[PDB]
Structures are given as structure tokens and as C-alpha cells.
Design a protein around this ligand. Structure first.
Ligand SMILES: CCCCCCCCCCCCCCCCCC(=O)OC[C@H](COP(=O)([O-])OCC(O)COP(=O)([O-])OC[C@@H](COC(=O)CCCCCCCCCCCCCCCCC)OC(=O)CCCCCCCCCCCCCCCCC)OC(=O)CCCCCCCCCCCCCCCCC
Ligand SMILES: CCCCCCCCCCCCCCCCCC(=O)OC[C@H](COP(=O)([O-])OCC[N+](C)(C)C)OC(=O)CCCCCCCCCCCCCCCCC
Ligand SMILES: CCCCCCCCCCCCCCCCCC(=O)OC[C@H](COP(=O)([O-])OCC[N+](C)(C)C)OC(=O)CCCCCCCCCCCCCCCCC
Ligand SMILES: CCCCCCCCCCCCCCCCCCCC(=O)O[C@H](COC(=O)CCCCCCCCCCCCCC)COP(=O)(O)OCCN
Ligand SMILES: CCCCCCCCCCCCCCCCCCCC(=O)O[C@H](COC(=O)CCCCCCCCCCCCCC)COP(=O)(O)OCCN
Ligand code: HEC
Ligand code: HEM
Ligand code: HEM
Ligand SMILES: CCCCCCCCCCCCO[C@@H]1O[C@H](CO)[C@@H](O[C@H]2O[C@H](CO)[C@@H](O)[C@H](O)[C@H]2O)[C@H](O)[C@H]1O
Ligand SMILES: CCCCCCCCCCCCO[C@@H]1O[C@H](CO)[C@@H](O[C@H]2O[C@H](CO)[C@@H](O)[C@H](O)[C@H]2O)[C@H](O)[C@H]1O
Lengths: 244, 71, 75, 383, 85, 124, 54
């Protein structure tokens, strides 16, 4: 297959979470949530994430309750069996922009924007692919490329023509921590946030792995000593043969 | 402004200059070929995707670490 | 080569202090450490693994029912 | 008389794990048998636990796996342990089978444990294939579709058999629910056959790296091989830890994190890595039925090693030419694996055919010829 | 072809005296450094060709095949690709 | 393959001058690279024994030959488990690599094959 | 060494009790040690480090 059909392979960026002992940067996760909420969430759902998931990762209990309480969710029917709405709770999932696929495609010239909850695991490249894609729209497609109508050129996307246009531009978001919201900074934060959304156990998993590595290595060393200790009578055995 | 704009420009003029030239030459050829008539009824239409990939791959190798250092 | 009463040479391996309590105690320290890490590793493994059967996060979220009181009239 | 010998139940355990007389010179490649037993124990424990949280209905399957990852305490670990140990199971089984082929473990008097072993290997393949479908991601669905359609090649009744397997006209909910029930069962069948091949082996005992009798010099299984097994258990657990905790998705396909969609076809539909050599063999034959037969024959041909090896000596330790041929056979098997996941393009099409011919000619031509000539060289060379 | 302890199926043994010492009396790691360096080197040197020859051959075959495949799917390889299909 | 087969084919080769000129040097190199002599084995110690015919041949070994074979097997097993090679007098020299077992197995197989033939005789 | 052997090692009941008590101590202390070390190598990155802003 041609390189174009594969898509250009994203660079390996030095993410904070790269590194056997490294967690996510939670300040970046919080900023990335804000990019999700203000830019991506217009077209993309994050359906696997509940408000409670943000608590103690990016937000306090009160902030997350406030986000939930601003929305309306379907309640159980009232006593005459008529539909009712309630305010959101921490157990509720973050609601998506569209009621069904047909509505989603109608708003995006036929293309269906995927749910982003697993996108960092569902694409080769992970955070690097998301970062490369969001920052990799050239001003002009390479001479000779004919884009289908409603397609945008992006070399990281296989085949080159993606139905999503460039969306991150310097200062589309105003970060609440005073960080300069440049295209690169926003792409880095939202890629970090999406990686967390795909693998929220990441920080705990790598710490438990460090404990396991240490214990298992010590046990491996001791098991070698013990095996050698027990085998030495066999290894050291000597014979004298006197032919009968 | 976006730190990447300057880093990418510097890498194209510097360590990735040979690749930049090939991309430039390619675009010149393709544009000129599109200008010529009976291009629409040609068998093979050349693009510059390959050259573009070679250049971008090169820029990324010389920039990725620098860019994340200033974010 | 012929006499079986002449023990083959074991001097490359023999410890001088083979009959001492210190000598045995060292090897039991190694065995004991191994048993200790195996016990601590088993305990960790069992506890973390079996915890899958305790109420999951979504179940724990569906507990603690909150009820308003403004809606409820007197009597 | 000691209780471990006198009581019939204790004596069965005793005969297999304690007083069992072993050769005194087994090398570390005799440790894969206990690693395979460990993988089987891990897969049973993790698999039964996943079954407590998984839902086999197609509307909920993929989401139940996400619930395991996200909500169940340690669910991420149990899921990653189960998925990675499936790969480790195949690494250990290829090592165990490679040991058996190099050291002549298939020769008399061990033809029966070897022949039951070949069935164990077939059951492991089926077990792993059904388990992979249960996620119900894109690779799950499309892998099930293409692999189950190979049955359509069976003449006359093939199409009918496929619809019967699927329980419908395509891979869907009926297929997923039956694969769950069979995936749960098949590991128990596998454990029985594993036990059978050991009982069959117990009549001759383990072979050994020199290929000679060990009846002259036996060691108890315990404590010698118990403590030697602990070393490779902890080495395995270190590898397990590195994948499960630090790189849990290295051995997987990202497309399996997209929910199954019968409309969109993924760019490349490949089996899991451990099935790749058999897929390359199937591609090599242009005919559909031809390809299926070749692929099955590639596993069943292991049953003829007892016949085609004409050597008067067991195993390769002392056979320089056989060792070279074995080296080429193994590397060819790895190349077939690689070719199983490339695109169907030049020049890999022809290369796959040449590697397929080499694979079969090992059994049919080279091993019978080389083993015949080495017999003559040992005789003449030592006169 | 295997009996059990006391009747294992060995031909009659006679004339061999076997000697060994207690695990507590021995140094388990005696001669470890010599073994780790010189013994491993000897054992590895004697088996090296049986690994190197097939691995190097099949790696070269792969390398040539993968480089050709890559070249056929470039612009330069258009014509050769057309013939190859 | 039967020892009978191997011995007969070898004798065809040793008869042909051309064939022996090219095969005998190869066979000697093969034996050197095989390396069984470096564990103190003789070639015949390596022959598979778990067969009725071979068990009968081994029972017919003279007691001395039998006791020496047991020692070579035990000694080689101890070299194998220690990852050492024979040194000095433990290495089998080419002149010691005698076919002590071949005559016994050839007689066992001779009778076994005659019995198979005679089980299929047809009175003419 | 004799004393230590006689008290903690000679009886297997005592040996196993000492091993289990040591495993209990190891488990608690290792937990605390790793927790602190993990917090130091990942300093300023964790929620506990930024929580004070909110
Ligand atoms: C996966 C799960 C993890 C569990 C790990 C289990 C793997 C252990 C195992 O079976 O292999 C260890 C194994 C050590 O086992 P060993 O029992 O000491 O000797 C077994 C060999 O038969 C003895 O072979 P040898 O004595 O002839 O020594 C040969 C070996 C040297 O092996 C040494 O260890 C020295 O060196 C090589 O063959 C390297 C090839 C040269 C490349 C350049 O390593 C090898 O010898 C691998 C050689 C394979 C090629
Ligand atoms: C997995 C669980 C590990 C449990 C550890 C508890 C203590 C047992 C142990 O480590 O072995 C010591 C004991 C004894 O090891 P031992 O047999 O070397 O000690 C006997 C000799 N004395 C008592 C003088 C030291 O092992 C057992 O009792 C079997 C339990 C195996 C674990
Ligand atoms: C890759 C190619 C491997 C070729 C091996 C050649 C022999 C060698 O050097 O190995 C070292 C050793 C040599 O050991 P050995 O037992 O022959 O000799 C020991 C030393 N002497 C001769 C002095 C007594 O071989 C092994 O241990 C081989 C086990 C083979 C396992 C292969 C797994 C492949 C899985 C695919 C399955 C289908
Ligand atoms: C089934 C899968 C088998 C592989 C096990 C590997 C580790 C799984 C346990 C979870 C883990 O990461 O434990 C760490 C410690 O490592 C450890 O100490 C575990 C490493 C020990 C591995 C082998 C030990 C026993 C394994 C099987 C025995 C089973 C018998 C009873 C279950 C974390 O520690 P934590 O803080 O999470 O721990 C809680 C109490 N502090
Ligand atoms: C974590 C999992 C492993 C930890 C268990 C190992 C035992 C811990 C220390 C105890 C110990 O060393 O004592 C011996 C117990 O070992 C034993 O009795 C067992 C010896 C080795 C343990 C496991 C054997 C593995 C072999 C096969 C692996 C199977 C994998 C398949 C699931 C008895 O010492 P002694 O009995 O020598 O005599 C000495 C005189 N009493
Ligand atoms: C107004 C529309 C719109 C906005 C805003 C938007 N997207 Fe998308 N996105 C799409 C559409 C449509 C697709 C599907 C494109 C296709 O498949 O051709 C898509 C696809 C993607 C993909 C998958 C590309 C692939 O490999 O399949 C990722 C990742 C993505 N978007 C992330 C983002 C992130 C991160 C943001 C913003 C911070 C974002 N999107 C903003 C419409 C949008
Ligand atoms: C030899 C034993 C086994 C092997 C090789 C095996 C293999 C597999 C594989 C490859 C998968 C797909 C894993 C993934 O990528 O997510 C899987 C999934 C699964 N297996 Fe097994 N398995 C075995 C035993 C069992 C047993 C005994 C059960 C008992 C029910 C079981 C239950 C499951 C379940 C519920 C899933 C789906 C959830 C998931 O994907 O994690 N497995 N298995
Ligand atoms: C679940 C999978 C398996 C398990 C748990 C298993 C376990 C074992 C064990 C414990 C032994 C004795 C120790 C050893 O030699 O390693 C052994 C020996 C053997 N196994 Fe397996 N095995 C499995 C699969 C296979 C397969 C697939 C084959 C063959 C294709 C096979 C063929 C043999 C043979 C021939 C022996 C005797 C080898 C010898 O000692 O010379 N086994 N197996
Ligand atoms: C053979 C079985 C014998 C009966 C034994 C019964 C064991 C069943 C008890 C399950 C106990 C789980 O108990 C609970 O475990 C988890 C780890 O799993 C601990 O959790 C602690 O470590 C984990 C990682 O290990 C972190 O995710 C967590 O933030 C931390 O608090 C809790 O502090 C503890 O209260
Ligand atoms: C490896 C998993 C551990 C569990 C063990 C497997 C359970 C099922 C094994 C039972 C199958 C019967 O297995 C059979 O048992 C008897 C006694 O137990 C063994 O008999 C062997 O040991 C006993 C004494 O130990 C002797 O009387 C006998 O001469 C000898 O052959 C057989 O060699 C074995 O083939």
C-alpha cells in the first residue's frame, strides 16, 4: 500500500506519562477537559465518562456536581406516567451533542464524528496520533491531491481526506489557569485528557506495577539462591568406577 | 503565537532543506502540468504527497522534542 | 581411581564452618525471606483480585439516595 | 508404609508431583510444561472472574468489557491479565512443542503423549479464537466472519454448516452467545487432555536432553524440579508484569476498541499473532478448499513425525545437520508468521508460497532424507 | 519402559561409587564467576553457527522482500508494480 | 530405521571405491562435530533402547560390557546436568569407539525379520 | 546465632509465625515507602498537588 493510504506516522512526542514511573500531569488533564468541553463536545461525545470520573482527577466533588446539576436528564415518569426531567447527578454520564447517528451525520456532511472515550486506544499512535492530527492540517494540500467535497487534507489521516476540519486555533479557549492557549498547547492538553479518558487506571496501574516488579525481582533472586542451594549435592556428585 | 510555527520553519530551512527542495520542485512541476491542457484526460496525474511525507517526517524528527519542551 | 575409601576432592566446595548455627541460620534466612515475600505477594494478589467481587464503582454510585423535601406537602 | 504411598488418592498426587522419578539432567526447556500449567490456572481464574462481569448479549458485550475496565475493582488487571496470558500461553506452547521436536520427544515410546498433545494444540487454538470474538470489537466480528466462512468450503454442506454455526445468516448475537458458552467450556476440555497426555507420558517417563535412558539415574520430582520450576515461574511473572502493568495493549489490535460494525470493514483483517503462520499457509494455496486443507494439514502433519524421522538416535543434541535443518524450519515458521500479517502484495505473495513449500517439505522430504544420511554417517564415522 | 523406585528398569549396576556433600556443607555459588564467563562463552561459541546462519538468512530474505514491496508502492516503482500485478 | 538397514547400506557404500572415497571423510568429520565423544559416550550408547528388539540385545550383552555401559550413561548424564564436557581419559578416543552392541542387535533383528518372512511362506 | 536459631527457626511453627509476622510488617512498610517515593518522582503532577487551587 502507498504511504498515503496508510497515513503519515506521527512523531513520538515526550508525554509526561511516558516513563515507567510517570503519571499524567493532572493540570494538563484539567486544561484538556476544558478544550473537550469548549471545542470537541460540539460534535463528539464522551459517553463512557461519568461526572464522578472527573472527581479527584481533574475536579473537586463540588465542581463536578455543579457541571452535572446544570444539565437535564430523563427522570422516571410521573404518577400519570408522563415524561419528566431531573437535574444531573455525579452518577450520570456526560451527555453527547446528538440524539442518534443520523442526526450526527446530518450535522457533519455525512461523516460520523466518533465517540472519543476510547479513541486514544482505538488508533495506532494514541496521544501522538491525536496531537499530530489536530496540529497537522497544512494550509494547502500538496499539489495534485484532489479532495472529495467536504473533505480536508490531513496527512496523518489514512488516505489524506478527513471529514473534520481544523478546529484548534490560537486563543479559541481561554484557560482558567492562565496558560497561553496556542494550537500546540491545546492539542497537547486535549490529547492528554483523551488518553486519560481511554485508560483512567493508568496512574494506579503503573504504581502497582512498580511494587510487583520489586517483589517479583527479589523473589526471582532468592529463588535462584534456593535452587542452587538445593541442587548442589547433585551438581557436586563425584564417581569412582571400578569395572567388575 | 504558536511555538510550532517558528520551529517548523527553522527545521525546513535548516536540517530538512534537501527535502524542502524536493517538495518545492515537485509542486512546481505538478502545478505546471495542471496548467497544460488535456491534463484532465491524462492517464497518470502526479501528486506531491510522497515528497510532502518525506519533508514532514523530517521536520517532526527535528522538532517534536523541542516543541514539547516549550509547552 | 580405584580405592573407594579415598573420598574425591570436595575442597573447592566445602565450607569450613559447615556445622555452625550461623551457617544454617544464613540459609534459613534466604528460605525465610523467600517465604515472606511469597506470603506478602499472595496476600496482595488475593486481596486485589477478590476485591473484584465487592460493589463496583457504578453500583456504589447508585447507593446513597438523595430525596428533596420541598416537593413534599404537609400531611 | 508412608501415607503418601498407602492412600490411593494421595498416591496419585505423589506419583505425579513428588516421588515421580525424573531424569537428573533436564534443562530449562523442560520447564515449559509447568509454565503451561500456570497459564492454564491463570486463564481459569481470570476467565471465571471475567464471566462474573461479562454479558454475552451482542447489545451489551462490548460495553460489559468497558465496565470491567472502568468500574469493576481491579477489573483492568483481570482483563489485561487474561488477554496477555493468552499470548503467553502460545509462547509457552510453541516453546514446549519446539523442545519436543528438537529432542525427539515424539519418538517411541512417547508417540501417544505427543499425539494427544497435537489435539491439545488444536483445542487451544479454538479456545483462543472464540475468546477473542467475545469482546465484540471490529476485529472480533470481522475475524469471526472470515474464519467461520472457511467452513463454507466443505463441499455440498459447507454453507449449511456455516449458518448452523452462526445460528443465523451472519455473525451476530446468536454466534456471540454460543461462543461464550463454548469458550467457557473448552478450557475444561483442554485441562482433561493435558492430564491425559501426562498419564500417557508416565509409562515411559520424561525424555531428557541426551536422548538416552534415564532409568540408570533418577531424581525425585520434588524437591529438585519444584525448586527449578520456581525460577521460571518468577521469570514468567516478571514478563507478565511488564506487559500487564506497563504495556497492556502492546500485543493487541487497536481496532478491537472500536465496537463491531457489520457495515464498515477494517483496513486489514488478521488473526491474533499466534495464528499468523497458519494464515500465511492458507493464503499460499489459491483454491479456497485447497487453502483450508493445507492449513489443517499444517497442524495434523505433526502426527507423522514419529514415522518420517528415520533416525536410530533420539533427538538433535548430537546431530549437526539435523540441528541446522531444525534452525531453518523454526525461522521459516517465524517468517510465515510475519507474512501472515503483510498485505497481499508483491513480492510477498510468492515468498509466502515458497515458505509454505519449505514448511511441508521439512516433514515429507528433508527430515526423512537427513535422518537417513545421519544414520549412515554415525555408523561409518565411528567404525 | 520405566518402573518405579527399587525396580526402575536399569541394567544391573555394579562397581560405581558415588559421593556427594550436604547442601549446608557446600558453597552453592562456588565457581560462579568462572562459570558465568568462561563456561557460558564456551557453550555459546559452540552453538553460535546454528543460530546465526538461519536467523541471518531469513532476516536477509525478509529485508529484501520488504524493501522491494516498499519501493513498488512509490511513484518510482509504478511501472514495475503494474507488471508485478 | 532398523540397525540392519543402516549396516547394509553402509556396507554398499564401503564397497564402492568412489563412494567410500567421498563418504568416509565426511562421516569422520560428522562424528567429530557431533561431539558425543566429548561426553565420554561411544556411538552405540546413543541408540534408542526402548524397543523389544533393543531390550533383548541389551540383555545379551556380556556383564562387563553391560556394567561399563551403565557407567558411561551415568557419567554422561552428570556432565549434561553440570554443563561440562569430559576431559582427559573421560573423552572417548576414536580407537575406543567400538561397536560393542551392533552384533547383538543384528542377531536379534535377523531372527525377527526371518520370523516375519516365514510367517508369510506359501507352500509351492 | 544459636539463640536466634533456637527461638525463631528450629520449630517450624515458630519459623512460619516469624515469616507471617514479617510478611505483615513488610506489607505495611513497603506500602508506605512506595507511596512516598511515587509522590516524589511525580511531584506537582498528581491531583493531590493541585487540589489546593480548587
Ligand atoms: C517466556 C516465559 C519466560 C520463562 C523463560 C524460560 C526460558 C528458559 C529456557 O528454556 O532457556 C534458557 C536456556 C538456558 O538453559 P540451560 O538449561 O542452562 O541449557 C539449555 C541448553 O540445552 C544448553 O545449551 P548449550 O549448553 O549448548 O548452551 C548454548 C547457549 C548458552 O546457554 C547458556 O545459558 C550459556 O547459547 C546459545 O545457544 C546462544 C546462541 C548464540 C547466539 C549468538 O538458554 C539457552 O541455552 C537458550 C538457547 C536457545 C537457542
Ligand atoms: C504462598 C504462601 C507462603 C507462606 C509462608 C509461611 C511460612 C512457610 C515458608 O515460607 O516455608 C517455611 C516452611 C519450612 O521450610 P523448611 O522445610 O526449609 O523448614 C524446615 C526446617 N526448619 C523448621 C528447622 C527451619 O515451609 C513449610 O512449612 C511449607 C509451606 C510452604 C510455603
Ligand atoms: C532460532 C533457531 C534455533 C536453533 C537451535 C539450534 C541449537 C542451539 O544452538 O540451541 C542451544 C541448545 C543446544 O542444546 P543441546 O541440548 O543440543 O546441547 C547441550 C550441550 N551439549 C551438546 C554439549 C550436550 O538447544 C536447545 O536447548 C534447543 C531447544 C529448542 C526450542 C525452540 C523453540 C522454537 C518455537 C517454534 C515452534 C514450532
Ligand atoms: C492471577 C495473576 C497472577 C500474577 C500476580 C501478579 C500481581 C497481581 C497482584 C496485584 C499487584 O500488583 O500487587 C502489587 C504487589 O505485588 C506483589 O507483591 C505481587 C507479586 C507476587 C507475584 C506472585 C505471588 C503470588 C501469586 C499467586 C498466589 C495466589 C495465592 C493466593 C491468591 C500491588 O500491591 P498492593 O498495594 O496492590 O497490595 C495490596 C496489599 N498491600
Ligand atoms: C508465590 C508462589 C511460590 C511460593 C511458594 C514456595 C514456598 C516458599 C518457601 C517454603 C520452602 O521453601 O519450603 C519448602 C516448601 O516448598 C515446597 O514444598 C514447594 C517447592 C516449590 C514450590 C512450588 C513448586 C513448583 C513446581 C511446579 C510449578 C507449577 C506451576 C503450575 C501452576 C519445603 O522444603 P523441602 O520440601 O525441599 O524440604 C526442606 C525440609 N522440609
Ligand atoms: C464541528 C465538527 C468537529 C469538531 C469541532 C471536532 N471534530 Fe473531531 N471529527 C469530526 C468528524 C466529522 C470526524 C470524522 C472524520 C472522518 O471520519 O472523516 C472527526 C474525527 C475525529 C477523530 C478520529 C479521526 C480518525 O482517525 O478516525 C479524532 C481523534 C477527533 N475527531 C478528535 C477531535 C478533537 C480532539 C477535537 C477538538 C478539540 C475535535 N475532534 C473537534 C468533527 C469534529
Ligand atoms: C485456555 C484458556 C483460555 C484462553 C487461551 C482464553 C483466551 C481468551 C482470549 C484471547 C480472549 C479475548 C481477550 C481480550 O482481548 O479482551 C478471552 C476473552 C474472554 N475469556 Fe477467555 N481464555 C481462556 C479461558 C477462559 C475461561 C476458563 C473463561 C471462563 C469463562 C474465560 C472467559 C473469558 C471471557 C468472559 C472473555 C471476554 C472478556 C474479555 O475480553 O476479557 N476464558 N479469552
Ligand atoms: C495445556 C497445554 C500443555 C500442558 C499444560 C502440558 C504440560 C506438560 C508437562 C507438565 C509435561 C512434563 C514436563 C515437561 O516436559 O515439560 C509435558 C510433557 C510433554 N508434553 Fe506437554 N503440555 C501441554 C501441551 C502439549 C502439547 C501441545 C504437546 C505436543 C504437541 C505436548 C507434548 C508433550 C510431550 C511429547 C511431552 C513429553 C516431553 C518429554 O518429557 O520428553 N504437550 N507437558
Ligand atoms: C483465600 C481467601 C481468604 C479470605 C480473604 C478475603 C479477602 C477479601 C478482601 C478484599 C479486600 C479489599 O480491601 C481493599 O483492597 C484494596 C486493594 O484491593 C485497598 O485499596 C488500596 O490499594 C489499591 C491498590 O491495591 C488502591 O487502588 C487504593 O486506592 C488503596 O486504598 C483498600 O484499602 C482495601 O480496603
Ligand atoms: C500433575 C497433576 C497432579 C495430579 C496427579 C494427576 C492425577 C491423576 C493421576 C492418576 C492416574 C493414575 O496414575 C497412575 O497412578 C499410579 C499410582 O498413583 C502410578 O504408579 C506408580 O507409583 C506407585 C507408587 O507411587 C507404584 O505402585 C507403581 O509401581 C508406579 O507405576 C502410575 O505410574 C500412574 O500412571
Amino acid at each position: 500500500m502507498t504511504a498515503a493510504e496508510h497515513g503519515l506516522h506521527p512523531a513520538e512526542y515526550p508525554w509526561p506519562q511516558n516513563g515507567m514511573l510517570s503519571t499524567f500531569d493532572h493540570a494538563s488533564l484539567r486544561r484538556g477537559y476544558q478544550v473537550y468541553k469548549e471545542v470537541c463536545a460540539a460534535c463528539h461525545s464522551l459517553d463512557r465518562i461519568a461526572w464522578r470520573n472527573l472527581v479527584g482527577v481533574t475536579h473537586t466533588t463540588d465542581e463536578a456536581k455543579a457541571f452535572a446539576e446544570e444539565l437535564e436528564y430523563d427522570d422516571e415518569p410521573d404518577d400519570e406516567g408522563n415524561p419528566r426531567k431531573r437535574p444531573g447527578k455525579l452518577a450520570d454520564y456526560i451527555p453527547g451533542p446528538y440524539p442518534n447517528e443520523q442526526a450526527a451525520r446530518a450535522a457533519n456532511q455525512g461523516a460520523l464524528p466518533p465517540d472519543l472515550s476510547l479513541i486514544a486506544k482505538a488508533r495506532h499512535g494514541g496521544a501522538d496520533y491525536i496531537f499530530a492530527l489536530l496540529t497537522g492540517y497544512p494550509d494547502e494540500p500538496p499539489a495534485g491531491v484532489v479532495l472529495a467535497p467536504g473533505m480536508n487534507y490531513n496527512p496523518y489521516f489514512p488516505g489524506g481526506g478527513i471529514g473534520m476540519a481544523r478546529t484548534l486555533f490560537d486563543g479559541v479557549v481561554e484557560y482558567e489557569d492562565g496558560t497561553p492557549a496556542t494550537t500546540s498547547q491545546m492539542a497537547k492538553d486535549v490529547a492528554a485528557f483523551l488518553t486519560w479518558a481511554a485508560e483512567p487506571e493508568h496512574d494506579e496501574r503503573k504504581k502497582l506495577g512498580l511494587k510487583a516488579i520489586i517483589v517479583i525481582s527479589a523473589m526471582l533472586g532468592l529463588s535462584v539462591y534456593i535452587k542452587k542451594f538445593k541442587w548442589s549435592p547433585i551438581k557436586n556428585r563425584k564417581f569412582i568406577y571400578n569395572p567388575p | 503565537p504558536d511555538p510550532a510555527i517558528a520551529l517548523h520553519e527553522a527545521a525546513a530551512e535548516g536540517p530538512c532543506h534537501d527535502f524542502k527542495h524536493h517538495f518545492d520542485e515537485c509542486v512546481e512541476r505538478v502545478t505546471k502540468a495542471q496548467e497544460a491542457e488535456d491534463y484532465d484526460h491524462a492517464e497518470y496525474k502526479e501528486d506531491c504527497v510522497e515528497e510532502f511525507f518525506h519533508l514532514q517526517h523530517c521536520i517532526n524528527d527535528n522538532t517534536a522534542d523541542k516543541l514539547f519542551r516549550v509547552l | 581411581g580405584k580405592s573407594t575409601y579415598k573420598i574425591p576432592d570436595f575442597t573447592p566446595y566445602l565450607k569450613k564452618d559447615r556445622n555452625t548455627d550461623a551457617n544454617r541460620l544464613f540459609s534459613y534466612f534466604m528460605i525465610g525471606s523467600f517465604g515472606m515475600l511469597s506470603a506478602a505477594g499472595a496476600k496482595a494478589t488475593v486481596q486485589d483480585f477478590l476485591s473484584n467481587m465487592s460493589a463496583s464503582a457504578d453500583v456504589l454510585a447508585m447507593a446513597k439516595v438523595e430525596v428533596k423535601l420541598g416537593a413534599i406537602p404537609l400531611g | 508404609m508412608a501415607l503418601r504411598k498407602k492412600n490411593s488418592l494421595l498416591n496419585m498426587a505423589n506419583s505425579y508431583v513428588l516421588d515421580s522419578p525424573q531424569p537428573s539432567n533436564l534443562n530449562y526447556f523442560w520447564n515449559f510444561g509447568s509454565l503451561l500449567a500456570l497459564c492454564l490456572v491463570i486463564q481459569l481464574a481470570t476467565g471465571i472472574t471475567l464471566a462474573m462481569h461479562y454479558t454475552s448479549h451482542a447489545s451489551l458485550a462490548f460495553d460489559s468489557v468497558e465496565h470491567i475496565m472502568r468500574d469493576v475493582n481491579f477489573g483492568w488487571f483481570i482483563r489485561y491479565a487474561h488477554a496477555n496470558t493468552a499470548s503467553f500461553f502460545f509462547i509457552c506452547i510453541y516453546a514446549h512443542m519446539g523442545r519436543n521436536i528438537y529432542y525427539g520427544s515424539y519418538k517411541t515410546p512417547r508417540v501417544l503423549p505427543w499425539s494427544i498433545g497435537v489435539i491439545i494444540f488444536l483445542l487451544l487454538i479454538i479456545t483462543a479464537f472464540m475468546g477473542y470474538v467475545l469482546v465484540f470489537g471490529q476485529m472480533s466480528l470481522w475475524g469471526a466472519t472470515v474464519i467461520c466462512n472457511l467452513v463454507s468450503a466443505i463441499p455440498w454442506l459447507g454453507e449449511d454448516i456455516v449458518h448452523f454455526l452462526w445460528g443465523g445468516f451472519s455473525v451476530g448475537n446468536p454466534t456471540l452467545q454460543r461462543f461464550f458458552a463454548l469458550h467457557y467450556l473448552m478450557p475444561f476440555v483442554l485441562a482433561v487432555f493435558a492430564l491425559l497426555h501426562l498419564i500417557a507420558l508416565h509409562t515411559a517417563g520424561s525424555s531428557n536432553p541426551l536422548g538416552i535412558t534415564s532409568n540408570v539415574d533418577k531424581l525425585s520430582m520434588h524437591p529438585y524440579y519444584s525448586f527449578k520450576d520456581l525460577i521460571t515461574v518468577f521469570a514468567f511473572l516478571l514478563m507478565f508484569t511488564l506487559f500487564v502493568f506497563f504495556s497492556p495493549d502492546k500485543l493487541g489490535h487497536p481496532d478491537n476498541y472500536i465496537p463491531a460494525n457489520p457495515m464498515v470493514t477494517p483496513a486489514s483483517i488478521v488473526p491474533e499473532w499466534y495464528l499468523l503462520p497458519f494464515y500465511a499457509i492458507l493464503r499460499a494455496i489459491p483454491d479456497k478448499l485447497g487453502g483450508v486443507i493445507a492449513m489443517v494439514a499444517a497442524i495434523l502433519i505433526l502426527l507423522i513425525l514419529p514415522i518420517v524421522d528415520r533416525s536410530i538416535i533420539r533427538g538433535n543434541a548430537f546431530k549437526p545437520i539435523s540441528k541446522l535443518l531444525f534452525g531453518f524450519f523454526i525461522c521459516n515458521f517465524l517468517l510465515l508468521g510475519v507474512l501472515g500479517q503483510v498485505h497481499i502484495e508483491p513480492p510477498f505473495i510468492v515468498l509466502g508460497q515458497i515458505c509454505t513449500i519449505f514448511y511441508f517439505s521439512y516433514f515429507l522430504i528433508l527430515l526423512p532424507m537427513v535422518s537417513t544420511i545421519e544414520n549412515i554417517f554415525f555408523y561409518i564415522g565411528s567404525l | 519402559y520405566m518402573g518405579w523406585w527399587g525396580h526402575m528398569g536399569s541394567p544391573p549396576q555394579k562397581g560405581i561409587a558415588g559421593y556427594t556433600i550436604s547442601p549446608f556443607a557446600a558453597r552453592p555459588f562456588a565457581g560462579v564467576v568462572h562459570a558465568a564467563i568462561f563456561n557460558t562463552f564456551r557453550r555459546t561459541k559452540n552453538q553460535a553457527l546454528f543460530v546465526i546462519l538461519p536467523v541471518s538468512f531469513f532476516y536477509y530474505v525478509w529485508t529484501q522482500a520488504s524493501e522491494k514491496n516498499e519501493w513498488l508502492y512509490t511513484k518510482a516503482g509504478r511501472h514495475e508494480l503494474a507488471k508485478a500485478l | 530405521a532398523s540397525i540392519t538397514s543402516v549396516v547394509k547400506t553402509s556396507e554398499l557404500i564401503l564397497k564402492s571405491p568412489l563412494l567410500s572415497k567421498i563418504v568416509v571423510p565426511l562421516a569422520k568429520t560428522y562424528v567429530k562435530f557431533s561431539g558425543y565423544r566429548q561426553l565420554g559416550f561411544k556411538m552405540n550408547d546413543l541408540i534408542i533402547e526402548e524397543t523389544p528388539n533393543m531390550q533383548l540385545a541389551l540383555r545379551r550383552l556380556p556383564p562387563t560390557e553391560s556394567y561399563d555401559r551403565v557407567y558411561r550413561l551415568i557419567r554422561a548424564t552428570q556432565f549434561s546436568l553440570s554443563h561440562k564436557l569430559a576431559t582427559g581419559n573421560d573423552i572417548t578416543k576414536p580407537e575406543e569407539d567400538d561397536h560393542y552392541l551392533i552384533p547383538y542387535i543384528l542377531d536379534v533383528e535377523a531372527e525377527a525379520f526371518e520370523k516375519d518372512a516365514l510367517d508369510n511362506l506359501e507352500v509351492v | 546465632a544459636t539463640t536466634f536459631y533456637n527461638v525463631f527457626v528450629k520449630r517450624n511453627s515458630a519459623f512460619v509465625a516469624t515469616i507471617l509476622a514479617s510478611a505483615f510488617v513488610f506489607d505495611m512498610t513497603f506500602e508506605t515507602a512506595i507511596d512516598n517515593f511515587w509522590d516524589r518522582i511525580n511531584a506537582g503532577k498528581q491531583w493531590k498537588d493541585i487540589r489546593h487551587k480548587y
